[PDB]
Scaffold this active site. Structure first.
Site, PDB file in Angstrom:
ATOM      1  N   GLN B 108       0.832  -1.243   0.000  1.00 22.07           N
ATOM      2  CA  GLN B 108       0.000   0.000   0.000  1.00 22.07           C
ATOM      3  C   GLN B 108       0.846   1.264   0.000  1.00 22.07           C
ATOM      4  O   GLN B 108       0.655   2.127   0.846  1.00 22.07           O
ATOM      5  CB  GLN B 108      -0.836   0.075   1.275  1.00 22.07           C
ATOM      6  CG  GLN B 108      -1.620  -1.187   1.577  1.00 22.07           C
ATOM      7  CD  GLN B 108      -2.784  -0.850   2.469  1.00 22.07           C
ATOM      8  OE1 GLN B 108      -3.356   0.231   2.380  1.00 22.07           O
ATOM      9  NE2 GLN B 108      -3.150  -1.777   3.336  1.00 22.07           N
ATOM     10  N   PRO B 109       1.777   1.461  -0.949  1.00 28.25           N
ATOM     11  CA  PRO B 109       2.820   2.464  -0.776  1.00 28.25           C
ATOM     12  C   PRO B 109       2.347   3.872  -1.154  1.00 28.25           C
ATOM     13  O   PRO B 109       3.171   4.749  -1.253  1.00 28.25           O
ATOM     14  CB  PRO B 109       3.915   1.939  -1.706  1.00 28.25           C
ATOM     15  CG  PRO B 109       3.156   1.297  -2.842  1.00 28.25           C
ATOM     16  CD  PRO B 109       1.857   0.785  -2.245  1.00 28.25           C
ATOM     17  N   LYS B 110       1.043   4.072  -1.344  1.00 27.79           N
ATOM     18  CA  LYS B 110       0.494   5.437  -1.497  1.00 27.79           C
ATOM     19  C   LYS B 110      -0.265   5.829  -0.229  1.00 27.79           C
ATOM     20  O   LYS B 110      -0.715   6.974  -0.165  1.00 27.79           O
ATOM     21  CB  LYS B 110      -0.361   5.484  -2.756  1.00 27.79           C
ATOM     22  CG  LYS B 110       0.326   4.942  -4.003  1.00 27.79           C
ATOM     23  CD  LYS B 110       1.660   5.592  -4.337  1.00 27.79           C
ATOM     24  CE  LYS B 110       2.271   5.072  -5.625  1.00 27.79           C
ATOM     25  NZ  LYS B 110       1.668   5.713  -6.819  1.00 27.79           N
ATOM     26  N   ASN B 111      -0.343   4.928   0.758  1.00 28.45           N
ATOM     27  CA  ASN B 111      -1.125   5.076   2.021  1.00 28.45           C
ATOM     28  C   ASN B 111      -0.374   5.997   2.976  1.00 28.45           C
ATOM     29  O   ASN B 111       0.668   5.534   3.498  1.00 28.45           O
ATOM     30  CB  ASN B 111      -1.341   3.725   2.721  1.00 28.45           C
ATOM     31  CG  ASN B 111      -2.180   3.835   3.973  1.00 28.45           C
ATOM     32  OD1 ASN B 111      -2.128   4.834   4.674  1.00 28.45           O
ATOM     33  ND2 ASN B 111      -2.984   2.829   4.254  1.00 28.45           N
ATOM     34  N   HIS B 147       5.497   9.634  -1.601  1.00 29.86           N
ATOM     35  CA  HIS B 147       5.621   9.265  -0.170  1.00 29.86           C
ATOM     36  C   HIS B 147       7.060   8.832   0.110  1.00 29.86           C
ATOM     37  O   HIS B 147       7.639   9.293   1.124  1.00 29.86           O
ATOM     38  CB  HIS B 147       4.604   8.187   0.188  1.00 29.86           C
ATOM     39  CG  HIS B 147       3.210   8.623  -0.073  1.00 29.86           C
ATOM     40  ND1 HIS B 147       2.421   9.185   0.905  1.00 29.86           N
ATOM     41  CD2 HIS B 147       2.474   8.618  -1.200  1.00 29.86           C
ATOM     42  CE1 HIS B 147       1.245   9.487   0.390  1.00 29.86           C
ATOM     43  NE2 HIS B 147       1.252   9.154  -0.899  1.00 29.86           N
TER      44      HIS B 147
END
Ligand SMILES: COc1ccccc1[C@@H]1CNC(=O)CC12CCN(C(=O)[C@](OC)(c1ccccc1)C(F)(F)F)CC2
Ligand SMILES: [Cl-]
Ligand SMILES: [Zn+2]
Lengths: 346, 314
Positions: B108-111, B147
């Site tokens: 989930q690396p946009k979270n 991020h």
């Protein structure tokens, strides 16, 4: 081709209604969806299709209120949703204390913006509280968190603050000097604005910064003509066919507003290509379910529908009210606020 | 310990150890709005999560209840915050967490909430030893993940780890010379180290930038940087650069170059230079070329500069 006004309504109708457990991840921010739908309709002049009065109740149910003893002033504003498990209380009874229950800058923003749109007069908003909480979110550096509990900080929330302060018509909720530092600090080597000093220039950031100053009414004071000139170039260099968020990235409908509005506040939106912006936007329009996505032949969402439609409205697209580019609500609703203020000033 | 999809998974409401807690339901009351419907198994977990919150309970059982609630929705800021409280309270091995998160950030690396939780864990451990290698792994999947760069810039600042990041930039420009995210990191590193005011570093950087235009001249990101590291010194003041670019005009011409030149001729006009009457026209030849055939999608922007230049200087 051409704009599916009727279907874009049927779309926003649906957003407001129900979604499956596939959308679990929106729980903590339903109110922002609500906004996209409701301003969505307000922008298509089809607000009549909702139960304003019953939504105004839902919204007020989400306001975090001061307790009997006003200990929790720092934690006031609105909630994303009821997900904390507080008894439903449409701002009737007073605060109902809870270690972890507290507002969220984005929700305070989308909550107020919704209420104004819906007709309500903000009478049931405890302003001193929201503003108190707002202030408590600003950091040394001038940027804001979204929650007192700690979180990411960056230009998004600087805007959220700017917008709350603007709507409550009371800038007591922020340290504008420091807010303005953060905005200035955040300009890049490419004259675009970034999430915060250091980072990549970005059309979203760039909007938030510029609109925040425009709301404060300091755009002219905070940046030199040379600066605004370099900023304008950065923005207008974002158009390839549709605008993209940052250089050497592929277009997205949403920036047809984020950058559009930025250029409209810098008084040069007129010098953009309108035909290619319009094609690209409509290029994404989903002809079966309605709304718009970032890209064409690609799944549409509440945000990209709202922003697509708003970005069209910037080009006086037919059937869509002029959008107020700094405040991100219909011009009608902006006019509706002017009054709501001229009223309090007595 | 009890996996959400074990055959022998059991609801919290039929769990012995949980008998004594009354669960808390969510209610949006008469009209709901953007209602999400929730499964049996989900509402169960979150009915008990709310309960344990209501009652600020600093249990282990709660700490485990968080992992299950994060599984269902890692977007719930409140759940993460409360997990961070139990990490403090129960005095949990922060390294076990710094591994638990590594997995979730990948999925989930946009979270926002997980990038935050990783940052907090590093502020606590004051140990960046893991960070630069992990961020380059995320950047290997998306070399423009905002991020990831935010985190990397924050680590490199907070524990002045500047020593290798210019090499890393030089590598990812070999990888994609068009990456706006990496040209940023370059100026970030230099601007917080050498600084550009060393004449020698400036020679280094302007040379490097031009090489990467000769390589791929339709690249906003490189020209942005060239202008960036020079515009405050005065584009006029480097006449070897003006003459170098005029010699690219035949083979390496892009709207980005023609622009650059306008911006030189504008600075010349601003630094009350020799031949206002003449330079202006050199700038207007170009504003017109842009509008006419080079940068047509800005037909009217470039026209407007044409008007803006004449009104400043006649
Ligand atoms: C680097 O990302 C950005 C930076 C600055 C502005 C905008 C974006 C971006 C634009 N397109 C998107 O798809 C998502 C984003 C806008 C919605 N986001 C929000 O957080 C937001 O609405 C969901 C928002 C609403 C109005 C303005 C700014 C943010 C919230 F504040 F209300 F929560 C997340 C980022
Ligand atoms: Cl305009
Ligand atoms: Zn988008």
């Amino acid at each position: 081709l051409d704009f599916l006004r009727d279907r874009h309504v049927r779309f926003f109708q649906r957003c407001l209604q129900v979604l499956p457990e596939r959308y679990s991840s929106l729980e903590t921010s339903r109110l922002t969806i609500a906004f996209f739908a409701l301003s969505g309709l307000d922008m298509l002049d089809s607000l009549d299709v909702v139960n304003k009065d019953d939504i105004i109740e839902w919204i007020y149910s989400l306001q975090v209120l001061p307790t009997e003893d006003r200990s929790n002033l720092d934690r006031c504003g609105f909630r994303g949703s009821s997900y904390l498990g507080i008894p439903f209380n449409p701002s009737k009874n007073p605060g109902t204390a809870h270690p972890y229950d507290s507002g969220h800058i984005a929700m305070t923003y989308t909550g107020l913006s919704c209420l104004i749109i819906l007709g309500d007069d903000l009478s049931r908003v405890d302003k001193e509280a929201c503003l108190a909480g707002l202030r408590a979110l600003q950091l040394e550096d001038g940027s804001f968190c979204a929650v007192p509990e700690g979180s990411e900080n960056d230009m998004r929330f600087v805007y959220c603050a700017s917008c709350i302060c603007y709507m409550l018509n009371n800038w007591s909720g922020m340290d504008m000097k420091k807010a303005i530092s953060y905005i200035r600090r955040s300009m890049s080597y490419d004259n675009g604005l970034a999430q915060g000093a250091g980072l990549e220039s970005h059309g979203g950031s760039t909007f938030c910064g510029i609109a925040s100053l425009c709301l404060m009414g300091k755009l002219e004071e905070v940046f030199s003509e040379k600066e605004l000139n370099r900023i304008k170039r950065w923005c207008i260099m974002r158009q390839q066919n549709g605008y993209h968020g940052r250089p050497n990235k592929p277009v997205d409908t949403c920036y047809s507003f984020w950058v559009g509005a930025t250029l409209k506040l810098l008084k040069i939106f007129q010098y953009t290509n309108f035909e290619k912006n319009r094609n690209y936007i409509l290029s994404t329009q989903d002809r079966l379910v309605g709304g718009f996505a970032k890209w064409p032949d690609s799944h549409p969402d509440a945000l990209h529908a709202y922003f697509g439609i708003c970005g069209l409205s910037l080009m006086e697209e037919s059937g869509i009210c002029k959008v107020h580019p700094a405040l991100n609500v219909s011009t009608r609703t902006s006019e509706r606020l002017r009054d709501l203020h001229q009223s309090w000033k007595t | 310990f009890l996996s959400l999809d074990s055959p022998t998974y059991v609801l919290y409401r039929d769990r012995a150890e949980w008998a004594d807690i009354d669960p808390v339901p969510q209610n949006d009351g008469p009209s709901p709005v953007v209602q999400i419907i929730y499964s049996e198994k989900f509402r169960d977990v979150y009915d008990y999560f709310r309960a344990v919150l209501q009652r600020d309970e600093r249990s282990e059982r709660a700490f485990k209840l968080t992992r299950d609630a994060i599984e269902l929705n890692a977007a719930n800021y409140t759940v993460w915050h409360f997990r961070r409280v139990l990490l403090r309270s129960l005095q949990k091995d922060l390294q076990e967490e710094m591994n638990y998160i590594i997995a979730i950030i990948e999925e989930q690396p946009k979270n926002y909430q997980v990038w935050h939780h990783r940052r907090v864990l590093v502020e606590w451990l004051k140990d960046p030893s893991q960070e630069l290698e992990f961020i380059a792994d995320i950047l290997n999947q998306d070399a423009k993940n905002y991020h990831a760069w935010q985190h990397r810039q924050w680590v490199i600042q907070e524990f002045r780890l500047w020593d290798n990041e210019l090499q890393y930039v030089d590598q990812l420009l070999k990888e994609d010379v068009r990456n706006n995210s990496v040209w940023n990191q370059r100026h970030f590193v230099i601007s917080n180290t050498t600084g550009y005011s060393d004449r020698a570093v400036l020679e280094r950087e302007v040379q490097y930038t031009l090489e990467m235009i000769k390589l791929v001249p339709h690249n906003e990101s490189a020209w942005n940087y060239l202008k960036g590291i020079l515009q405050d010194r005065g584009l006029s003041r480097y006449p070897n650069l003006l003459n170098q670019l005029l010699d690219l005009q035949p083979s390496h011409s892009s709207p980005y170059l023609i622009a650059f030149l306008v911006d030189i001729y504008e600075d010349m006009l601003e630094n009350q230079c020799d031949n206002k009457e003449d330079i202006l026209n050199k700038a207007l030849e170009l504003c017109e070329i842009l509008a006419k055939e080079k940068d047509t999608i800005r037909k009217e922007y470039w026209r407007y500069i044409g008007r803006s230049l004449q009104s400043k200087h006649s």
